[PDB]
């Protein structure tokens, strides 16, 4: 009932997915072999949303894993937790895009996109009632940004009356993993804005602050870093997977948090985050969860709200815990931080409560907030892009694969246009 399809593109998508489906397996009590070994029957009431029943109590997931190079699939296939995927889903190419937009959207993406479009259509008909699409990709590389944008356009035209969520990874401001970051970003965003519904802008080095400071980890590896991304990934969509006193769903969030079609760039956040040694000295209660959530320190995007305002906010609590203090504390946050909210949107808070606590924790909360602070996130990217394109650098081979100089004209003329309304609304009266 209300199934959603998981799509993974780029190297991050499989790396995030390899740990994402680890989390879902533990929640539903699924052994690595793929056989149910759980005890509670509440988890099996709604199991079709993510997994699919198969012959002899098999539970293969509804996952599509696609990459341009075989260097990522061999890891998940040969490694553990690869025995439950269906090998038909393991779509792979021959060579990577090489961090090229054209080599991920025009030249080689034409023949690969036709193969995946078959499997997703095959998966869609197998579904009972499709609810939406859940996509994971990177905005910095070529395969994740290039084809993933192309796949969205093809999915959008075939399924116009359906919702989709993109858990994109915004390029890090302070550190640049790839030399050519701005060129990939602006080309993807210019095509993403008009053909998507709701995106979660997370950051790479912003995650580094939390694990090093809040979790007090000295060597944060990608295994631990991706684990935090999974927690805020399994919490947003846990409302329809489990019962609750005030339920939510994928469409419910999109109605409350998208005032305008263009303004659909979000900011996630997770709480609580306590280390193994320092968790004995903190009373896990409802009060501190909201306080530990709204502060600029525990935020998953490299943005300071102190320079901006919160347009809308949605908090998805979990675990067995009463609701009276949820609103009385939300009112206190609304009153104490009253200078940090938009005036022409009253009571701009949405709340929802689940029933099943996360593994090894009594209660937790997930915060997603549409804020104006993203305005400076795009300006920094736009400032970097407009400097390099003026020198006409690195584009001597971009034109070699079909794309042309005039393509830059519209991409840049909209990012400054998008940020114009993204900012003029903040001071609008």
């Amino acid at each position: 009932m209300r199934e959603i399809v998981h799509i993974q593109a780029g190297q991050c998508g499989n790396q995030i997915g390899a740990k994402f489906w680890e989390v879902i397996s533990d929640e539903h009590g699924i052994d690595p072999s793929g056989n149910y070994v759980g005890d509670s029957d509440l988890q099996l009431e709604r199991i079709s949303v993510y997994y699919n029943e198969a012959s002899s109590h098999k539970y293969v997931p509804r996952a599509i894993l696609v990459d341009l190079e075989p260097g990522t699939m061999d890891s998940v296939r040969s490694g553990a937790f690869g025995h439950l995927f269906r090998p038909d889903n393991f779509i792979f190419g021959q060579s990577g895009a090489g961090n090229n937009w054209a080599k991920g959207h025009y030249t080689e993406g034409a023949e690969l996109v036709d193969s995946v479009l078959d499997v997703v259509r095959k998966e869609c008909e197998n579904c009972d009632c499709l609810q939406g699409f859940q996509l994971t990709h990177s905005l910095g590389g070529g395969t994740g940004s290039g084809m993933g944008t192309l796949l969205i356009s093809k999915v959008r035209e075939e399924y116009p009356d359906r919702i989709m969520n993109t858990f994109s990874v915004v390029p890090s401001p302070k550190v640049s993993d790839t030399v050519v970051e701005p060129y990939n970003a602006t080309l993807s965003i210019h095509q993403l804005v008009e053909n998507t519904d709701e995106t979660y802008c997370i950051d790479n080095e912003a995650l580094y602050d939390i694990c090093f400071r809040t979790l007090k980890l000295a060597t944060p590896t990608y295994g631990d870093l991706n684990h935090l991304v999974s927690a805020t990934m399994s919490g947003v969509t846990t409302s329809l997977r489990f019962p609750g006193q005030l339920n939510a769903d994928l469409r419910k969030l999109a109605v409350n948090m998208v005032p305008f079609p263009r303004l659909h760039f979000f900011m996630p956040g997770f709480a609580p985050l306590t280390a193994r040694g320092s968790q004995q000295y903190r009373a896990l209660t409802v009060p501190e969860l909201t306080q530990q959530m709204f502060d600029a320190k525990n935020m998953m995007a490299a943005c300071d709200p102190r320079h901006g305002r919160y347009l809308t906010v949605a908090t998805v609590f979990r675990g067995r815990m009463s609701m009276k203090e949820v609103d009385e504390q939300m009112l206190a946050i609304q009153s104490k931080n009253s200078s940090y909210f938009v005036e022409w949107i009253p009571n701009n808070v949405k709340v929802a409560v689940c029933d099943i606590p996360p593994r090894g924790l009594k209660m937790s909360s997930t915060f997603i907030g549409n804020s104006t602070a993203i305005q400076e996130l795009f300006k920094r990217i736009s400032e970097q892009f407009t400097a390099m394109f003026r020198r006409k650098a690195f584009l001597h081979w971009y034109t070699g694969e079909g794309m042309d100089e005039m393509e830059f004209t519209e991409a840049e003329s909209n990012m400054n246009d998008l940020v114009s309304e993204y900012q003029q609304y903040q001071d609008a009266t």
Partner: protein
């Protein structure tokens, strides 16, 4: 013999109905599975009797999302309900009145109407409808509008009572709450005989102060609202020294075609340890019920004037002391009635004392009072909601969603002007006028 049917819409409706039907089962001495170990008719008003000794409710549970209905199916009340009535769609309206009223709402309305017609033709002396629905919920508001229109079209002149869930002024859980409220109120202003209001923040204040509970989950609030529902219905369900009916309620509360928005109150609401140190006399419970800190809508009647009042006493009661308490409250200064209503009181008495649920927050009582007041203190709530809606709509937020889901601008404009006129008329009637 006089049959009333209950329609529960939305998750709030389903949970409130679960609590209410639990309370009915304890009241009529029926086990959850349908068997049983003044009394017997009473249950024939609600519990239709089947071939065997089982009794089945006259409830119509309807929802779009299937999760809450799955929960109520899996609950301990799985045998009692007739499995056909539990009507579920596939996806919820997601706090979109447009979705809940136009797009998906028309694909299940036929089935719910068919079941309503089947149940209404099954009974003999049908009395009316009790609709348990919320206001913030998109499915709740959309199905409220659609079902009001359809039932008014089908059955001409019957009682249509609603137990709404008013949006709280400070407590808030939605963002499209003003839009849902304005649209549903404009649509169902002309298609309801008498609509009660209940607010969650007020119930939370009541449970915090009067009952002194620090962990007030939704169960306690649902228990309270179910207690008010049972108290208002005990007049039909039981015999008393002075009976009262739903038509009596309407004709004694609502004086005008539009001014039909009363508010409910219950008494006594005291804890378990405080029960031993209290007397529970008729006069003191009457004063407690009229106390402004016990009303279940976050509006203090001191800012307005009472216009009509109905009180149902149940248990051991003497009409003389009832009369004395009513007279002294009438002569009290702070309570102020309207000039053109020299008699603003309607009293009913019932011989059945209320019964407390096992494990409940309340304590056993021998006397109970339910109060229903049509006043002008709801005008401030209407004005506040209208101001919030106008402020939100001044720059066209979420209008793209609403218009894309089959709407226009005339609907918003006419709802705004309609509630402006309604508030103006409410204030003009409530305020004293020369001659």
């Amino acid at each position: 013999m006089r049959e009333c049917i209950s329609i529960h819409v939305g998750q709030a409706g389903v949970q409130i109905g679960n609590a209410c039907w639990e309370l009915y089962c304890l009241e009529h001495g029926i086990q959850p599975d349908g068997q049983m170990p003044h009394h017997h008719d009473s249950f024939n008003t609600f519990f239709s009797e089947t071939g065997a000794g089982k009794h089945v409710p006259r409830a119509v549970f309807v929802d779009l999302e299937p999760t809450v209905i799955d929960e109520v199916r899996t609950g301990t009340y799985r045998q009692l309900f007739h499995p056909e009535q539990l009507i579920t769609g596939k996806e919820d309206a997601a706090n979109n009145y447009a979705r809940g009223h136009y797009t998906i709402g028309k694909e299940i309305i036929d089935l719910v109407l068919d079941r309503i017609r089947k149940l209404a033709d099954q009974c003999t002396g049908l009395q009316g409808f009790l609709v348990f629905h919320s206001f913030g919920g998109g499915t709740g508001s959309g199905f409220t509008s659609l079902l009001m229109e359809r039932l008014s079209v089908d059955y001409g002149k019957k009682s249509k009572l609603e137990f709404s869930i008013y949006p709280a002024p400070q407590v808030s859980t939605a963002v499209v709450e003003p839009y849902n409220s304005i649209l549903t109120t404009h649509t169902t202003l002309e298609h309801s005989d008498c609509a009660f209001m209940v607010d969650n923040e007020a119930i939370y204040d009541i449970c915090r102060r009067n009952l002194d509970i620090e962990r007030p989950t939704y169960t306690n609030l649902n228990r309270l609202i179910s207690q008010i529902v049972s108290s208002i219905t005990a007049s039909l369900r039981f015999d008393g020294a002075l009976n009262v009916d739903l038509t009596n309620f309407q004709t004694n509360l609502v004086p005008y075609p539009r001014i039909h928005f009363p508010l409910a109150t219950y008494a006594p609401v005291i804890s378990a340890e405080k029960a031993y140190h209290e007397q529970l006399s008729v006069a003191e419970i009457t004063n407690a019920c009229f106390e402004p800190a016990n009303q279940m809508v976050k509006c203090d009647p001191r800012h307005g004037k009472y216009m009509a009042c109905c009180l149902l006493y149940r248990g051991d009661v003497v009409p003389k002391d009832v009369n004395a308490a009513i007279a002294t409250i009438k002569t009290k200064r702070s309570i102020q009635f309207v000039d053109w209503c020299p008699t603003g009181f309607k009293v009913g008495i019932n011989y059945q004392p209320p019964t407390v649920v096992p494990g409940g927050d309340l304590a056993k009582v021998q006397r109970a009072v339910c109060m229903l007041s049509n006043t002008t203190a709801i005008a401030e709530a209407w004005a506040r909601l209208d101001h919030k809606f106008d402020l939100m709509y001044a720059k066209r937020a979420f209008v793209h969603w609403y218009v894309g889901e089959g709407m226009e601008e005339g609907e918003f404009s006419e709802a705004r002007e309609d509630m402006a006129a309604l508030e103006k008329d409410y204030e003009e009637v409530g305020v004293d006028s020369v001659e």
